[PDB]
Design a binder for this molecule. Structure first.
Ligand code: SF4
Ligand code: SF4
Ligand code: FES
Ligand code: FES
Lengths: 104, 178, 437, 127, 58, 238
């Protein structure tokens, strides 16, 4: 729900929105715009950055935009005085050539 | 074998294209069938050689048909119609009776060796049921235990089928049962 | 009375029983003394093959041997003019209970057929014809062989036939039995010398047959019907039988009826008429009658059913189809089950196997179901099973026999189901009446 | 039901004969199969009087002229079958209570079986 | 303990579950699936998945 | 080229071609047993039966593989009815297929096996499984018959792979085998008794069951365990 004001935004910014029928969601971003976007989220009341899973798609039986892909899991702890349980992933495909990305 | 009766081949080969040869196999078999009452391996191999084909081929082909044979089969091959119409006409009971009469089971030949048995599929003589044929020599129509045994006893006495004749009668092309 | 009628007609006349059962009709000259050859002589000299096609094409002549594909159209699949001769193959094997119609024709009036086949031959531009007779009818093969020597003697065969360089020649070919030897592609193996395996069918024998050369195969009845056609005209043909099913047909009957056999009747006569009036009525309580062939759906003994015309197109309207005209009358003295049991014990023997689904499926499974049930070891479950097995077979086969083999049992489970459910659930052996008639 | 038992006992019997003939003529025997239900039996009750599901007599070429198979324990339609290669001869032994073991309906005896065998052996004589 | 009573202990879809071993004795299809399961092991479909849970350790 | 749509994807693929191949090009699939690479099909397996729209739907499921292609054609493969049927045919196939898996050395290469598990499964979410409707005793026939100094034959393996018999015709054009008895009584054999053809052994590979195996490595290893080392022959100048 905290999520939703992110979602309309994401849609507005045209970011592709992955969804598994298991109700897991990724948001496909470029590298550049990430940091700030993600800044805005914490501000928007995102409690808890749970994960960073680095992905190697060296060999995959389908095409992907990039070989290296990061994925953040952000969460809103509802058991905290703020939060809604709003948990979602952000995926960001990553050039192999530059293994860079601004921290969080 | 028919290297004495090659004429029969010439007769049959004329019926076929030069390369249409395999057809003849069927006549050759049936010829052997008549004369020896079944088919010894060597014959089939021989036919094979004649037609130049592989034995194996010919074997399968042979094995594709009720008619052909490969064992000592008693002299009067009683080919009992067992199918539906006839079954309804008590070919069932007939087949019971026969088998118990000779005693010997199916696939057996009487120790005398005058009687081979086989149930068989429709003889398309349903109207004149229950019918049996002894070899391919005309149909033994609407037999009853009497008609049957009269025939049997005649055969049993070393006669031929057109020497012992059946009590009762049957209709012609249209049959009548009573 | 009026035209395009069937039933009882003063103006109906048998022709294929006008001289069957009358002896010496294996004398060519006897045959001559009741027409023929004249009619060929004319035809060759009168009309093109195409034209006599058109004649039959108006006759509406349908297939036979359980077929009903208009033979006109069947010629429409022919090429004509391709530098390759063609072949006329007589499907002179039939074998299946209740089925036996062609038999006496072969036995008693060879020279007829041969004329029809000369006619037909010319029509499909085939200079040689094979008659493929089941090798179980011996008389017929004798009588035919004799006839071809006869015709050949008088120069009705050879390469000139009337000085006409239509060259026409025959051979007889004695079988070794099995239904499947009839199958149009299978036969081609059999004859060409190779065990049956039905071949590819988007190639039709029609468009390319035996060693590439396109053949036409016809049933004896069909072939015989050419002579009446050429003799007496298509209008005259249409004058007999229904619009739907034109001409007469060699209807047959079997089962407990006073006179069973072949009754050459116009087409559209009802069952009632045939069964009572002609065949001589029943003798015994009938459960059902299996109308035509035997592959046809059996339909219970019912008045409204009997009053249906025996035809291609109204048994159609009773959801069935017409077989070879080989009715079987089935008493309830025996159990219907036992009929279908026996039936599938026939089919299972005679499996092509090429229909794989039906090799393992029917000839392995289906049969065994019956056996278990009617010993009195059945359960409802099994029948349900059995029922459910059927569509899995039904659609699809490499020869349409399986699908035909379900149809009787299919029908019997549509109607008489109850009987099965009874005997099975109660683990009860089938009754056995003494079948000594 | 318990038909089963006498059948099994008969199956052994028949088998015994098959061996006897085998030794008698010196003709080749080979056991073909054993029960599935022996393999995958693994603590569940086994009590079959032999272990042998299928066995055959061969010409001496590894080609049988006679095959002989029993039905498995819980495999319905319990019968014993024979079949002669290249003969299309398929024999269905039933058991009939109050009689014994019957060939169609005719009781089997050893001699019957021998006769079948000799005609097989000698006729088909593939080697 | 209150909520405890008899029941099957795993999913009875034998496609996805290895079958009971008291049935190898019986059907071929069993045998096939059994064999297969313990050799190759199934193919789940393509996907990523995550479930959050509370362990003892967090 | 011919305009095909298999279900959700379209392909060009020139004419005279089999539906089947376009199916596999399209990334759609079917069980397959009779026809094979480098060999003229037959209809026999009947596994390639689909339904097709062109837009109606056939009343009888044609073996797609056998049929040619058509422009504007629709091919339906994800059909519920297909899947059911597949299972069906599978079951039918399995009816006499003798239980021998552990000692089956077709094994990992029992493609048949793999199709079974792929396409099979009873029609019923289940709360209780089914396995069969069959329960009668199986056929028992021929086994342990050495067919050759290199090749052991245990007959009841064969599914009526007609492949080898076919091979002999197609490939060498030298024949040595044949089906024997008819219907269910049938079975393939030789009457050469040891096949003097110079090409023979390929049939081992072709055998889509384990009927024809290399005796020399019978009971010596298991299919999966082997390292299958692609490499080059030199034993003939080919
Ligand atoms: S052929 Fe295949 S399914 Fe059969 S036992 Fe061998 S590996 Fe198993
Ligand atoms: S031995 Fe194998 S390849 Fe040959 S027909 Fe049988 S299953 Fe097919
Ligand atoms: S059912 Fe016996 S001759 Fe037809
Ligand atoms: S691949 Fe078998 S029917 Fe086509």
């Amino acid at each position: 729900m905290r999520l939703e004001r992110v979602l309309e935004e994401a849609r507005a910014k045209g970011y592709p929105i992955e969804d598994n029928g298991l109700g897991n969601l990724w948001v496909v971003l470029p590298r550049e715009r990430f940091k700030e976007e993600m800044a805005h989220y914490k501000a928007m009341g995102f409690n808890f950055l749970a994960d960073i899973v680095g992905l190697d798609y060296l060999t995959y039986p389908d095409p992907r935009p990039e070989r290296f892909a990061v994925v953040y899991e952000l969460v809103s702890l509802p058991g905290w005085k703020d939060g809604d349980g709003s948990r979602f992933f952000v995926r960001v495909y990553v050039p192999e050539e530059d293994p860079r990305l601004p921290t969080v | 074998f028919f290297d004495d009766k090659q004429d029969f081949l010439e007769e049959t080969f004329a019926k076929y294209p030069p390369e249409g040869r395999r057809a003849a196999i069927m006549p050759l078999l049936r010829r052997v069938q008549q004369e020896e009452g079944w088919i010894r391996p060597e014959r089939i191999e021989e036919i094979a050689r004649l037609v130049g084909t592989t034995p194996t081929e010919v074997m399968g082909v042979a094995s594709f048909y009720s008619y052909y044979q490969f064992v000592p089969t008693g002299k009067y091959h009683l080919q009992v119609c067992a199918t539906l119409s006839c079954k309804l006409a008590g070919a069932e009971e007939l087949w019971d009776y026969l088998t118990e009469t000779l005693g010997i089971g199916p696939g057996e030949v009487t120790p005398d060796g005058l009687f081979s048995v086989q149930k068989v599929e429709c003889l398309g003589s349903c109207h004149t049921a229950p019918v049996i044929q002894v070899n391919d020599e005309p149909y033994v129509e609407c037999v009853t235990r009497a008609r049957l045994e009269a025939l049997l006893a005649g055969l049993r006495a070393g006669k031929r089928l057109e020497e012992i004749e059946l009590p009762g009668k049957c209709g012609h092309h249209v049959h009548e049962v009573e | 009375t009026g035209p395009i009628l069937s039933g009882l007609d003063p103006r109906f006349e048998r022709t294929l029983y006008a001289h069957v059962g009358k002896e010496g009709s294996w004398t060519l000259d006897y045959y001559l003394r009741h027409g023929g050859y004249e009619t060929a002589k004319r035809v060759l000299k009168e009309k093109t093959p195409d034209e006599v096609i058109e004649e039959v094409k108006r006759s509406g002549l349908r297939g036979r041997g359980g077929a009903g594909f208009p033979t006109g159209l069947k010629w429409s699949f022919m090429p004509k003019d391709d530098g390759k001769q063609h072949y006329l193959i007589c499907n002179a094997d039939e074998s299946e209970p209740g089925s036996f119609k062609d038999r006496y024709i072969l036995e008693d009036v060879p020279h007829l057929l041969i004329e029809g086949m000369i006619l037909a031959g010319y029509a499909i531009r085939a200079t040689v014809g094979y008659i493929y007779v089941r090798g179980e009818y011996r008389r017929a093969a004798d009588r035919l062989e004799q006839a071809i020597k006869e015709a050949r003697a008088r120069g009705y065969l050879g390469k000139n036939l009337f000085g006409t360089d239509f060259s026409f020649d025959l051979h007889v070919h004695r079988g070794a039995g099995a239904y499947i030897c009839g199958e149009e592609t299978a036969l081609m193996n059999s004859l060409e010398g190779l065990r049956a395996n039905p071949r590819l069918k988007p190639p039709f024998p029609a468009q390319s047959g035996l060693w590439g050369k396109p053949t036409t195969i016809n049933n004896v009845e069909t072939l015989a019907s050419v002579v009446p056609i050429m003799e007496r005209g298509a209008d005259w043909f249409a004058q007999m039988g229904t619009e739907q099913s034109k001409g007469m047909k060699l209807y047959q009957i079997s089962g407990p009826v006073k006179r069973p056999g072949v009754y050459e009747l116009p087409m559209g006569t009802t069952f009632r008429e045939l069964i009572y009036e002609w065949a001589g009525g029943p003798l015994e309580p009938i459960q059902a009658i299996i109308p035509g062939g035997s592959s046809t759906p059996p339909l219970p003994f019912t008045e409204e059913v009997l009053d249906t015309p025996m035809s291609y197109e109204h048994l159609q309207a009773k959801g069935s189809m017409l077989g070879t005209g080989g009715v079987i009358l089935i008493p309830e003295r025996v159990s219907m089950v036992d009929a279908m049991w026996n039936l599938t014990r026939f089919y299972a023997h005679e499996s092509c196997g090429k229909c794989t689904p039906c090799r393992e499926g029917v000839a392995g499974f289906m049969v065994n179901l019956f056996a278990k049930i009617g010993t009195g070891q059945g359960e409802e479950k099994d029948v349900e099973n059995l029922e459910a097995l059927l569509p899995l077979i039904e659609g699809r086969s490499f020869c349409p026999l399986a699908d035909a083999a379900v149809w009787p049992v299919k029908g019997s489970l549509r109607h008489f189901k109850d009987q099965y459910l009874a005997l099975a659930r109660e683990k009860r052996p089938v009754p056995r009446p003494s079948l000594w008639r | 039901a318990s038909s089963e038992r006498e059948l099994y006992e008969a199956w052994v019997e028949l088998l015994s004969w098959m061996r006897e003939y085998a030794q008698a003529k010196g003709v080749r025997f080979e056991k073909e199969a054993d029960f599935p239900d022996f393999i995958y039996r693994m603590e569940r009750p086994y009590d079959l009087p032999t272990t042998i599901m299928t066995a055959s007599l061969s010409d001496g070429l590894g080609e049988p002229f006679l095959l002989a198979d029993v039905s498995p324990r819980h495999a319905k339609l319990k019968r014993i079958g024979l079949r002669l290669p290249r003969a299309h001869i398929h024999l269905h032994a039933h058991y009939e209570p109050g009689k014994g073991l019957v060939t169609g309906k005719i009781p089997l005896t050893k001699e019957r079986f021998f006769a079948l065998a000799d005609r097989a052996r000698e006729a088909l004589a593939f080697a | 303990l209150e909520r405890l009573e008899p029941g099957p202990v795993r999913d009875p879809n034998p496609q996805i579950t290895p079958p009971p071993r008291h049935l190898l004795e019986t059907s071929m299809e069993a045998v096939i699936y059994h064999f297969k399961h313990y050799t190759e092991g199934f193919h789940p479909p393509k996907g990523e998945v995550y479930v959050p849970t509370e362990s003892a350790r967090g | 080229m011919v305009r095909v749509k298999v279900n959700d994807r379209i392909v060009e693929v020139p004419p005279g071609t089999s539906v089947m191949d376009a199916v596999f090009h399209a990334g759609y699939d079917v069980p397959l047993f009779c026809s094979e690479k480098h060999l003229s099909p037959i209809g026999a397996c009947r596994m390639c039966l689909v339904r097709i729209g062109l837009i109606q739907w056939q009343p009888k499921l044609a073996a797609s593989c056998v049929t040619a292609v058509a422009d504007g054609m629709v091919v339906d493969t994800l059909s519920d009815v297909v899947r059911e049927a597949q299972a069906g045919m599978v079951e039918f196939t399995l009816l006499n297929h003798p239980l021998d898996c552990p000692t089956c050395d077709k094994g990992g290469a029992c493609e048949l096996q793999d199709r079974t598990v792929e396409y099979g499964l009873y029609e019923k979410p289940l709360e209780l499984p089914v396995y069969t409707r069959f329960e009668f005793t199986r056929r028992h026939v021929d086994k342990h018959h050495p067919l050759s100094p290199f090749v052991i034959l245990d007959r009841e393996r064969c599914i009526h792979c007609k492949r080898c018999v076919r091979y002999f015709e197609e490939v060498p054009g030298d024949e040595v085998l044949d089906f024997i008895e008819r219907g269910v009584h049938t079975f393939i054999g030789t009457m050469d008794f040891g096949l003097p053809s110079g090409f023979s052994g390929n049939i081992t590979d072709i055998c889509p069951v384990g009927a024809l195996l290399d005796l020399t490595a019978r009971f010596r290893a298991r299919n999966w365990e082997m390292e299958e080392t692609p490499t080059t022959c030199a034993l003939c100048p080919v």
